[PDB]
Amino acid sequence: IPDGTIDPAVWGKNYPEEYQTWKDTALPTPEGKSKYKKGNDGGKVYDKLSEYPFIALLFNGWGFGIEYNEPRGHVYMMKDQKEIDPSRLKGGGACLTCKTPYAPQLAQKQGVTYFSQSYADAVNQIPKEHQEMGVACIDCHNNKDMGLKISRGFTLVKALDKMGVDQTKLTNQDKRSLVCAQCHVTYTIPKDANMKSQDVFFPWDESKWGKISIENIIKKMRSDKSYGEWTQAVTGFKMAYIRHPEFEMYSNQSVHWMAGVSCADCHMPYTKGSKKISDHRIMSPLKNDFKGCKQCHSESSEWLKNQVITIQDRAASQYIRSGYALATVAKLFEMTHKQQAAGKQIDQKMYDQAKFYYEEGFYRNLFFGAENSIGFHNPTEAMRILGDATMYAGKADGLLRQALTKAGVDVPVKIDLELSKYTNNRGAKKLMFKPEQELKDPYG
Amino acid sequence: IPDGTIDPAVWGKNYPEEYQTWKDTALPTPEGKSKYKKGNDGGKVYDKLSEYPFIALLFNGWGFGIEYNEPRGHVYMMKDQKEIDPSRLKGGGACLTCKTPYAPQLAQKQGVTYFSQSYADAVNQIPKEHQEMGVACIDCHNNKDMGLKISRGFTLVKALDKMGVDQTLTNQDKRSLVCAQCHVTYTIPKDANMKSQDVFFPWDESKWGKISIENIIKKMRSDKSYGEWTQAVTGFKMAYIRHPEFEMYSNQSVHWMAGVSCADCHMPYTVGSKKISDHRIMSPLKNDFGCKQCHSESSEWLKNQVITIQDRAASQYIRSGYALATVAKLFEMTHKQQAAGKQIDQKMYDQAKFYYEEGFYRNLFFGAENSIGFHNPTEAMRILGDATMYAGKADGLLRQALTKAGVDVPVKIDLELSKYTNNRGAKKLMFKPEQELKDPYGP
Numbered sequence A: 001i002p003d004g005t006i007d008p009a010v011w012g013k014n015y016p017e018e019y020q021t022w023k024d025t026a027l028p029t030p031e032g033k034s035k036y037k038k039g040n041d042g043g044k045v046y047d048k049l050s051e052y053p054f055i056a057l058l059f060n061g062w063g064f065g066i067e068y069n070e071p072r073g074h075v076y077m078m079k080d081q082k083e084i085d086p087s088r089l090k091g092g093g094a095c096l097t098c099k100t101p102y103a104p105q106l107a108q109k110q111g112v113t114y115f116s117q118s119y120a121d122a123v124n125q126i127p128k129e130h131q132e133m134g135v136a137c138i139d140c141h142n143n144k145d146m147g148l149k150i151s152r153g154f155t156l157v158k159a160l161d162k163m164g165v166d167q168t169k170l171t172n173q174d175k176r177s178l179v180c181a182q183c184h185v186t187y188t189i190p191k192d193a194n195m196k197s198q199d200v201f202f203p204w205d206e207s208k209w210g211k212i213s214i215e216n217i218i219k220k221m222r223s224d225k226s227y228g229e230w231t232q233a234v235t236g237f238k239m240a241y242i243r244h245p246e247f248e249m250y251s252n253q254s255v256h257w258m259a260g261v262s263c264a265d266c267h268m269p270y271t272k273g274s275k276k277i278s279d280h281r282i283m284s285p286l287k288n289d290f291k292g293c294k295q296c297h298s299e300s301s302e303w304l305k306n307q308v309i310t311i312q313d314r315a316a317s318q319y320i321r322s323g324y325a326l327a328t329v330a331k332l333f334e335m336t337h338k339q340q341a342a343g344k345q346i347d348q349k350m351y352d353q354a355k356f357y358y359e360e361g362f363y364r365n366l367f368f369g370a371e372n373s374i375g376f377h378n379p380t381e382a383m384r385i386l387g388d389a390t391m392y393a394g395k396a397d398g399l400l401r402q403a404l405t406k407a408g409v410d411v412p413v414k415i416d417l418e419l420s421k422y423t424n425n426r427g428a429k430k431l432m433f434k435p436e437q438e439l440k441d442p443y444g
Numbered sequence B: 001i002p003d004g005t006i007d008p009a010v011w012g013k014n015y016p017e018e019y020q021t022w023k024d025t026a027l028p029t030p031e032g033k034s035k036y037k038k039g040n041d042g043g044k045v046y047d048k049l050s051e052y053p054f055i056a057l058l059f060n061g062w063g064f065g066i067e068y069n070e071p072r073g074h075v076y077m078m079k080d081q082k083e084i085d086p087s088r089l090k091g092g093g094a095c096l097t098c099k100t101p102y103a104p105q106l107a108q109k110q111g112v113t114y115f116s117q118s119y120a121d122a123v124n125q126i127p128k129e130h131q132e133m134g135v136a137c138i139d140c141h142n143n144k145d146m147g148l149k150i151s152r153g154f155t156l157v158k159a160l161d162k163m164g165v166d167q168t169l170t171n172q173d174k175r176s177l178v179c180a181q182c183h184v185t186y187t188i189p190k191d192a193n194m195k196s197q198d199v200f201f202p203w204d205e206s207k208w209g210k211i212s213i214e215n216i217i218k219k220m221r222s223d224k225s226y227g228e229w230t231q232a233v234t235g236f237k238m239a240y241i242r243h244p245e246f247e248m249y250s251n252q253s254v255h256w257m258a259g260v261s262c263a264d265c266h267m268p269y270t271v272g273s274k275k276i277s278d279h280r281i282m283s284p285l286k287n288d289f290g291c292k293q294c295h296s297e298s299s300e301w302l303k304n305q306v307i308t309i310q311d312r313a314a315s316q317y318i319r320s321g322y323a324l325a326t327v328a329k330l331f332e333m334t335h336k337q338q339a340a341g342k343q344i345d346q347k348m349y350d351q352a353k354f355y356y357e358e359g360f361y362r363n364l365f366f367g368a369e370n371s372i373g374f375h376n377p378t379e380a381m382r383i384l385g386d387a388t389m390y391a392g393k394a395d396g397l398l399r400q401a402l403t404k405a406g407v408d409v410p411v412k413i414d415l416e417l418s419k420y421t422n423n424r425g426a427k428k429l430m431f432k433p434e435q436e437l438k439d440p441y442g443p
């Protein structure tokens, strides 16, 4: 209750159950319960570059092409960021924004330096005792009455203002998703001429409540060259990026959203006399016997598990197929640039159109692959996005094949992706392909 | 109800309510309630070739490229086949199979002639007074107890046997199977003179609840007999897919795995301990939603959900349909270049043709299904996604081979759709631009 209290022990003194289950995200999750989200099952780390090998080629040229693991329980958020391969920490102090309760005051005390400083200096702004402290009670609760509060004013509230949302019209069921939307959103780190971070914002420009489309997000990402954060190595393109857009995906006219279901309904199941205790061991619903689903569905865990995986398998199929396709188009751009050096002249108009389409498909495939539900959050929308990804890839592929053939180059029907070179010997730790972790096309 | 009685008036003499709603499918449906299925709304005929202009090109070289309308009420079943453009009636006597209660007896009495005869001779097998009689009570009920019975043995039960299904099937199964007597895809194998030999459901190597588009395509490819028409733009001899509602709905869809039957949504019920079932079978968007019987959301919420899904599925269908039309036009360009002596890589041509078929049959499977994705949303999208993929593979291959042969391929292929949508058939059917169902996510 007292002002200035970050210490979760003070908050949990009168809330022992919530305090205990909150701590319990430290526990390893049960193995063999989820098909696609196995992070920290039996303590294992899951390498997304080994589950989805094409991203090892597509994300090559910055941190995401070196180390990129499945997510774990909340308590590890700072620790896992501490041990991630240093390539990912090139984003600097901006990377504290959704990880430590110190982020708001540090942003407000350092100004632009908060984002632009090195990650190490950023962590050293935090007291040593608190430098591994993950999301705490104060991050989603106000200390006067408890009850949901958006701590992340400088990101989520600013984005909501961009959308024209009236904060005085936000219900508690809204906040039962908005407290997660403080971090389970896609973001942009604008960079200056030295490629140093200037801000963190959610690219919700020109979007409305319940309608943050991938089309709108892409249009914002394209709108400014400060929004180019990395260079794709295989293509040499300076590109923007999309990260874990759970809130944008789920709230975009999905079935459960339109039914009024909040993140917490599925991820914070409750136990009830008149006194309510919500489970704060936030995890995959597949891994706590669907206890949240069963508060509105009277079906067995077996029935619900079947519904989820039936949907995820179709979506994962399209994701993998469009992913190999986009990697093929990247390899085709590599060929194009190697032919340009060898004097072959390429039609500038077909090249420009292919590049535009390739970006459209890439950002679509990335929106899906970055999202942590494998389509279950918004099934048909996810498929729509992947379908367009598939479309745009084809457009780019065909264009490059024509233009290259018009310049006299022989384009093989099968482009070799050489994924072994991208999946292995990654970074300082020389991370290797783990073939047992590959999530193969369920319909291939 | 006496034996040998097809007359539905005799059947409904003691079941007047069901008889009355059964008759009422003659009523025009209300305008402005459905987005995608508007057949006979206010008495209007909706031309699918004007709703989806690309299919006018893709289906060209037989009847589906001349006249192909949205479906309407059951009573008009025979009448609409009578007035359809004769190009579609070239299927012959086989086309009686899902339209007359006389079909089983005509099949058992005529043998192969039942399928091979002309449509006119087939209709002349029926008494003139009954020649416009659509699906009747005997087609779904036995006359001793009114229990649900499968009239179409020579089609549906044979397909069920092919699947290993033991008919000794619950009543909730038959609350979909009486619809699967006709709301399925079929194959009409042809002989050397293009004469119809049979009607069967290509469910080979499929299982109950798992009749995939992949299984269907593999069966259709398995025999030449199954080439029923020649696609004009490409010159390819092709198989076909028709209204696969049962295959689409029952392939591990949300409602299917929840145990919902066709009749749960399409024959809503209302009396003490007994049930009166609505036989004015129509779009649920058009009778204020049947849905209410397991859902506590408003009809507005349900309408919104349905059209939200349909808009996403229709977008993918429209995009892939234009892509497949483009690939077809590219083959046309390829054949005219070959005729001009230009040499085309046979291995790229072969791969492109195989991919074009894979994409075409997938896009057709969706476009022929009458729910626009709602029967099985993610599966519908998966199929469309794969169509999009295969179309893309064919397009690029053709562009490469054509460019390698020295041909200059425009970036945008002119489809010339107006020559395919207008001046169609005996009625000289024209494009109706007010009926076009444009891409909901387009510009």
Ligand code: HEC
Pocket: A067, A068, A069, A070, A071, A072, A080, A081, A084, A088, A089, A091, A092, A094, A095, A096, A097, A098, A182, A183, A184, A185, A186, A187, A200, A244, A370, A372
């Ligand atoms: C600066 C550029 C950042 C770095 C470095 C990392 N993050 Fe994040 N983060 C956020 C969420 C909601 C999750 C869980 C969902 C998911 O992982 O997809 C994560 C997860 C991580 C992890 C663990 C997973 C991994 O190995 O990638 C690491 C190592 C990590 N993040 C590093 C949320 C946010 C966020 C909120 C808006 C921001 C600004 C960042 N993350 C930025 C960085």
Ligand code: HEC
Pocket: A255, A297, B254, B255, B258, B260, B264, B265, B284, B289, B290, B291, B292, B293, B294, B295, B302, B303, B305, B306, B377
């Ligand atoms: C009449 C035409 C309708 C419409 C428009 C909808 N339903 Fe159903 N429904 C039932 C069950 C068990 C589920 C699974 C979810 C759950 O267990 O509660 C659903 C699901 C839906 C959805 C969302 C699913 C989807 O992918 O579309 C929607 C939009 C929907 N329904 C609309 C149960 C039943 C029935 C019980 C016998 C009946 C009848 C219907 N539904 C009919 C309809």
Ligand code: HEC
Pocket: A008, A011, A012, A015, A018, A019, A022, A135, A136, A137, A138, A139, A140, A141, A146, A148, A172, A175, A176, A179, A180, A264, A268, A270, A276, A277, A278, A279, A280
């Ligand atoms: C967001 C990421 C949260 C963090 C961090 C913590 N809690 Fe929480 N809590 C959250 C939600 C969405 C809810 C549901 C609120 C609702 O109105 O539905 C809760 C609930 C509580 C409650 C209310 C009683 C209950 O339903 O369990 C209490 C007393 C509570 N939480 C305490 C609490 C403590 C002590 C925390 C840190 C240890 C803590 N919460 C973290 C979201 C989030």
Ligand code: HEC
Pocket: A029, A039, A040, A070, A071, A072, A073, A074, A075, A076, A077, A078, A080, A098, A099, A100, A135, A139, A176, A179, A180, A181, A182, A183, A184, A263, A264, A267, A268, A282, A283, A284
């Ligand atoms: C930022 C401060 C966050 C808030 C608020 C919420 N989450 Fe979170 N989540 C965050 C991170 C950085 C991570 C990864 C942690 C790591 O060490 O890898 C996560 C992880 C999850 C998970 C996945 C893995 C697992 O739990 O086994 C889930 C299911 C999850 N988060 C759900 C969730 C919900 C529903 C939230 C709001 C109510 C929420 N989180 C808040 C960052 C942040």
Ligand code: HEC
Pocket: A033, A034, A035, A036, A037, A038, A039, A070, A071, A072, A177, A180, A181, A184, A246, A247, A250, A256, A261, A262, A263, A264, A265, A266, A267, A283, A284, A285, A286, A287, A308, A372, A373, A374, A376, A377
């Ligand atoms: C039920 C109706 C849900 C709602 C509402 C939300 N999510 Fe969810 N989530 C759900 C499922 C069935 C799954 C799949 C889990 C599996 O094992 O496959 C997920 C997944 C996630 C994850 C990843 C989980 C993990 O173990 O790594 C995260 C981080 C997540 N969901 C977060 C999240 C947020 C922020 C939501 C609201 C904006 C939300 N979920 C809604 C079910 C449901």
Ligand code: HEC
Pocket: A255, A256, A259, A261, A262, A265, A266, A285, A290, A292, A293, A294, A295, A296, A297, A304, A305, A307, A308, A376, A379, B254, B295, B296, B297
């Ligand atoms: C109430 C708060 C719910 C929770 C928690 C979960 N679901 Fe749900 N679900 C709910 C509604 C109102 C609806 C609309 C249909 C209806 O019954 O009114 C749904 C829908 C589904 C579906 C089908 C929709 C789709 O995803 O395409 C499934 C397959 C489903 N629900 C399962 C499910 C699971 C596995 C959940 C936990 C992970 C879950 N639901 C949470 C209401 C609520």
Ligand code: HEC
Pocket: B029, B039, B070, B071, B072, B073, B074, B075, B076, B077, B078, B080, B098, B099, B135, B139, B178, B179, B180, B181, B182, B183, B262, B263, B266, B267, B281, B282, B283
């Ligand atoms: C063959 C004998 C059929 C059986 C058995 C069932 N249906 Fe049917 N249906 C059939 C045809 C040939 C047509 C088109 C009729 C025409 O003149 O165009 C239809 C039409 C429908 C419709 C659309 C109704 C509308 O208002 O447009 C629906 C919704 C429909 N059919 C569903 C349906 C159901 C649920 C069935 C089992 C209960 C069923 N049909 C049986 C052919 C045949």
Ligand code: HEC
Pocket: B067, B068, B069, B070, B071, B072, B080, B081, B084, B088, B089, B091, B092, B094, B095, B096, B097, B098, B181, B182, B183, B184, B185, B186, B199, B243, B368, B370
């Ligand atoms: C059952 C296996 C059928 C066979 C064999 C044939 N048709 Fe049919 N028809 C069937 C259904 C379920 C429906 C309604 C659904 C739909 O997509 O229309 C129809 C509809 C028609 C229509 C009206 C709609 C239209 O296309 O104009 C006509 C004119 C029609 N059918 C004609 C027709 C012909 C010529 C056939 C022989 C090749 C034929 N049908 C076979 C079910 C079945």
Ligand code: HEC
Pocket: B034, B035, B036, B037, B038, B039, B070, B071, B072, B176, B179, B180, B183, B245, B246, B249, B255, B260, B261, B262, B263, B264, B265, B266, B282, B283, B284, B285, B286, B306, B370, B371, B374, B375
């Ligand atoms: C609800 C859960 C349904 C089940 C089970 C089945 N169908 Fe259905 N069907 C449903 C909807 C919401 C719609 C959309 C109607 C619209 O106007 O958009 C449909 C569509 C059809 C149609 C075409 C309707 C028309 O007016 O032309 C037909 C012929 C049809 N569905 C048949 C059908 C069959 C044969 C089913 C079982 C195998 C079946 N439907 C299941 C809702 C639901």
Ligand code: HEC
Pocket: B008, B011, B012, B015, B018, B019, B022, B135, B136, B137, B138, B139, B140, B141, B146, B148, B171, B174, B175, B178, B179, B263, B267, B269, B275, B276, B277, B278, B279
């Ligand atoms: C299939 C396409 C049918 C046709 C043609 C007719 N009926 Fe029907 N009927 C059908 C179904 C799927 C059902 C539901 C059966 C169940 O077990 O739930 C029915 C139901 C009846 C009943 C039972 C009472 C009721 O639920 O309404 C009766 C008495 C009945 N039907 C009579 C009837 C008559 C007289 C018909 C011709 C005019 C007729 N039905 C056509 C499917 C089909």
